[PDB]
Every structure is written in structure tokens, then in C-alpha cells.
Design goal:
This is part of a larger assembly, with 2 copies of chain A.
Chain A (H helix, E strand, L loop, with lengths): L1 H21 L5 H19 L3
Protein name (chain B): Spike protein S1
């Protein structure tokens, strides 16, 4: 089944691209880290007021 | 209503110790494109600094 397997693999990768290119939430685990750190610094700066 | 203190000339694009109407701080004074409204005298940042 080598031809089938290679074709399924190649198709699966194309699907990864379509998902990542359209679903912003796909990277929520990394975006959330950025947001938590940004929030921590913004809070710290606002305390100066 | 301001005190009996003489003004000095203003120097741009250099680090200076400034005093504007009693408001002091240290920084570089540059030309700006910030459109203050006629009633506004001071602008502020997030930290409440000038």
C-alpha cells in the first residue's frame, strides 16, 4: 500500500496548512502566553499612577 | 499665577533638566506632531508621567 500511504500522508499535510491558515485559535496556547505576559507588564506600569 | 523666576532659552534634541510651569523632569525635548487642543496644556502616558 505504499502509494496509498504516501498519498494519505501528502493529503494530511495539506490539511494541516488549511487549518493553520484559517483557524486563529489553533495557536491559542502560544498566544495566551504572550497575552498573560503583556497583561502582567501593563498592570505593573499602570500601578505607577 | 507664577513665581518670580526668570525663564531660560529652550534647547531641543538634547538631554536637559526641564521645568515647565513648575512641572519638572529630565528628558529630551523634541518637535512633535501631537495636536493638543487649545485648552490642553500637558499630555500624559499610561504611567501618568508627562
Amino acid at each position: 500500500n505504499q502509494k496509498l500511504i504516501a498519498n494519505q500522508f501528502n493529503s494530511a499535510i495539506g490539511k494541516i496548512q488549511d487549518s493553520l491558515s484559517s483557524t486563529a485559535s489553533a495557536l491559542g496556547k502560544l498566544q495566551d502566553v504572550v497575552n498573560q505576559n503583556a497583561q502582567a507588564l501593563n498592570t505593573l506600569v499602570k500601578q505607577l499612577s | 499665577v507664577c513665581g518670580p523666576k526668570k525663564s531660560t532659552n529652550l534647547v531641543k534634541n538634547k538631554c536637559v533638566n526641564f521645568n515647565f510651569n513648575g512641572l519638572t523632569g529630565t528628558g529630551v525635548l523634541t518637535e512633535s506632531n501631537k495636536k493638543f487642543l487649545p485648552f490642553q496644556q500637558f499630555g500624559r502616558d499610561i504611567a501618568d508621567t508627562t
